[PDB]
Structure 1
């Protein structure tokens, strides 16, 4: 209730209701290390916070003391935990909290402790009704916020809310087709629903992926996915894909494509294929092209594959 920056703010140490508690100071003793200096008003709040902790006190006054200590440092895991204890003890309307946090996560959406506190509140309420809409609001500010995606993946798993998340993916790839975080969510959704082993879903997905290369071909994230959803089936086994990519070579060539092809020719070699002597050279033409002029910052990685391919297959 008493705002930390009200004119009439008063220290806890000159507060009537708090007269009876002896505050607890922090002491790092003779040599401190990475000492933080702390204001009057701060050390006060945290001197009383330590006291109320020491004494496992399940008061209201304590519950309010937490909000003030979270204001000064929302990184203090202990403060959050103790707030969660008072939420339990005092039997607090968890919805009032689920709003209190929504505000703080916005101000601090890389903060582990608040993403946790929101998760706990949903495990308690078993109510994901709020979650997907709120996470897309955080994702609208940072569409690669690892905390937000973690939470979203956990909600969608824990309350099997899969029905709309593929549409949401399709939307955020229309938004930034280069977002590694969204190509992940796509495979997360499919891999936990349809699964890829339906031949028809695979046609769907490989087609969709290629469209988004024709659209923007220098995009690791799309090629990663194409390889992803195919590499365990055997890149060799789809000869319409090999021939399709060879026809992009002139206009849509990227290190990502040339690579893909090497990885096809490697799988072909692995699946004792027709023309080891020949395929190998097709793969080495490419390892050399990569090193020579396509993917030069891996000059020596691609050279090393050249050596690795010849030693597996001669």
Structure 2
């Protein structure tokens, strides 16, 4: 049996405040006895701006019922800073939240605020937590976003060593080994190899990157992630397509495709034809480019008939 807070001696001094819905509201939720009671007392606590242990206790009770309650999380963080609570303990509590499947974006934002405030000299333990969190859920968009923020924030403080960057690339390569179609891991690779301020972008560095990309294409020729990365890479560094063309050409009819091609690889690969088309435009061969665009439109990628026709008309 639930004991109402209006009967508890710990809360005797507090007068609860009802939700101010106005008359006959639309989309009302049939709040449970527990949730309504807790919110009634939170309304009172927050209105008087009480910073206390019982207030902290109450916010945990509410977020456990509704992890997506952004207002209550805001108040919780204020309570943590006012009461000068252990932020390390709070982090461990967030770990317990994930184990108990109490997950939502607000939990992840809370983690960011905690780590920003703790501001540890070495964020490795949190990096590890994120990796472990990504293993059974490898495409969690905001976990990936958080990982980007963490390395980015802590790097501006000069707290990410070269060894740390190296093991991060090691970890990324393993994620891509496990699932070459994990576009989130391709994105992380782009941060690690191209976009981050400290990325090694010497001439031989670019060469090695091309080798990795092409090896990925030869492994999985229909991998849209791999093609997008290739196109994005060449564009960003303003590199000509023609020199790489021999590696791509077999997919239209430096590491080369395996002979024979892997089983279950019907030709042509649509994005391989896009490459050929764009390499013709590079050579100012607009007619030959229009011809492959037309082929994509009417034969080899008909779902995008209108788009490839548009690209064809852009030449003729």
TM category, shorter: 0.7 to 0.9
* Superposition CA RMSD, Å: 1.8
| 2:173 match | 170
Query: Is the Cα–Cα contact under 8 Å of residues 291 and 312 in structure 2 kept in the other structure?
Result: no
Instruction: Mark the runs of 5 or more structure 1 residues left unpaired by the alignment.
Output: 1-6, 270-278
| Cα offsets for 1:235-264 (capped at 9, x unmatched) | 5x3533112212343456310110112122
Q: Choose from 274, 298, 307 the match for 1:259.
A: 274
Distance of aligned partners of 1:233 and 1:67 in 2 relative to their CA distance in 1, 3 Å threshold: closer
CA shift, 1:266, in A, is 2.1
Number of residue pairs the alignment of both structures matches? 292
| 1:144 match | 139
What is the TM-score of this pair, normalised by structure 2?
A: 0.87
| 2:245 match | 242
Between stretches 279-288 and 245-254, larger displacement belongs to: 245-254
Superposed, 1:205-244 pairs within 5 Å as 205-235=209-239, 237-244=240-247
CA shift, 1:197, in A, is 4.4
Q: Give the SS at the match of 1:36.
A: coil
CA distance in 1, matches of 2:203, 2:23: 70
| 1:16 match | 9
CA distance in 1, matches of 2:180, 2:71: 40
| 1:69 match | 62
CA shift, 1:103, in A, is 2.6
- Give the structure with the higher percent helix: 1
| 1:158 match | 153
Q: Choose from 155, 162, 186 the match for 2:189.
A: 186
Instruction: Mark the runs of 5 or more structure 2 residues left unpaired by the alignment.
Output: 254-260
Between stretches 53-62 and 279-288, larger displacement belongs to: 279-288
CA shift, 1:84, in A, is 0.8
Q: Give the SS at the match of 1:18.
A: coil
Between stretches 134-143 and 150-159, larger displacement belongs to: 134-143
Q: Give the SS at the match of 2:16.
A: coil
